[PDB]
Structure formats: C-alpha cells, structure tokens
C-alpha cells in the first residue's frame, strides 16, 4: 500500500521539501559519529531494546525536536557490518517533545507535526551503512534530511508522477495521500 502522510494544519501550505529541510535544521546534528562524544544524550533508544525494536527514537541536543522511526529495526553495534541500523522502516514521525520509551510500551511525541507511513522500506543487514534505512535515519540524526526527502519523493511519484516533495501537504491531501490533523 501507498505512502500515507499525516500533518498538523499548521503546515497545510508548506511543501514537504521545505518542511523536512526546516525540521532537520531545527533538530540539528547530534554528532553521533566516530571521534565525537557519544553518551546517553545522543544515542537515542529502542522500544523494546536494547539494540532492536518496533521503534527507534532520538531527541535533539539543540532544541525540543525529536523523531520516531517505526517498523522492525535492528542495530549491529560492533558486529559486522559495524554500526548499521537495518530492517523494515514503515514510518517516520517528526515533532517536538519525546515521551515514553520501552518501560511505557512505546515512544510518542507530545507535539507530533508530520508523519510519513507505509514507507515500505526494507534494508538487509548485508548492505551495512549503504542501506537506505540506515541512510534515512542517520541523515535525520546528522542534520541532513536529503535521504528521507529522496525516498518520500520516489514513493509519491510511484502513486502518481505529478506528486513530489515540492507538493504542499494540502495538495497531497487533495490527491488522497495525506490527512490533516487539527492544530
């Protein structure tokens, strides 16, 4: 089934590309890479975890921004191929104010702005950090929504070549692939 998008009416008139570039700049870069400090402020977490879950969530170290990746996700840690996030990525939820976690039975956003669902992304462990799931999520961790934008653009064009990340949310709701939520 086709990509589905939920959006707050606050963002009705934004293009998907402008929204993702702006949100990613607001979230910023948590600096989760070799040669940087990595600690409980920038690892994120899995539900249920420790290294696998139906959700991976991370809060910004620069703002109240957070995201939740949903599907059937796995992290290799030191195991070949090292530091790979792989598996099935069904959804990305973007907003502010991460709540919950494994002990609550799930993460949530107190202010969810936009979700992309039915992404249908499935990256095998063998692709390592070249897997699309890894690139999408690591991009969001790192201040760069370009991989997510490219996958949304392809999913929209697959529904109809007239739809793209340059469509507004309201245009995508008219097209039948998005749904507004009251702000």
Annotated binding site, which residues?
Answer: 32, 35, 75, 83, 129, 138
Contact (Cβ atoms closer than 8 angstroms) between residue 97 and residue 57: no
Contact (Cβ atoms closer than 8 angstroms) between residue 65 and residue 31: no
Contact (Cβ atoms closer than 8 angstroms) between residue 94 and residue 115: yes
- Residues belonging to the binding site for heme are 32, 75
Decide: helix, strand or coil at residue 104.
helix
CA–CA gap between residue 104 and residue 17 (Å, rounded): 33
Print burial letters for 59-75: b (CB count within 10 Å at least 16), e (below 16).
bbeeeebbbbbbbebbb
CA–CA gap between residue 123 and residue 130 (Å, rounded): 9
End-to-end CA distance of the chain: 27
- Residues belonging to the binding site for heme b are 32, 35, 75, 83, 129, 138
């Amino acid at each position: 089934m086709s990509i589905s998008i939920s959006y707050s009416t606050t963002y009705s008139g934004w293009t998907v590309a402008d929204y993702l570039a702006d949100w990613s700049a607001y979230f910023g870069d948590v600096n989760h890479r070799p040669g940087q400090g990595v600690d409980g402020s920038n690892t994120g977490g899995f539900n249920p975890g420790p290294f696998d879950g139906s959700q991976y969530a991370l809060k910004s170290t620069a703002s109240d921004a957070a995201f939740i990746a949903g599907g059937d996700l796995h992290y290799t840690l030191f195991s070949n191929p090292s530091h790979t996030l792989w598996g099935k990525l069904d959804s990305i939820a973007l907003g502010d104010t991460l709540t919950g976690g494994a002990s609550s039975g799930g993460y949530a956003l107190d202010s969810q702005e936009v979700s992309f669902s039915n992404l249908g992304l499935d990256s095998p462990i063998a692709q390592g950090r070249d897997g699309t799931v890894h690139k999408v999520v690591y991009g969001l961790m790192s201040g760069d929504s370009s991989a997510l934008q490219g996958q949304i653009d392809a999913l929209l064009k697959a529904v109809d070549p007239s739809l793209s990340i340059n469509s507004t949310f309201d245009q995508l709701a008219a097209a039948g692939v998005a749904h507004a939520t009251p702000a």
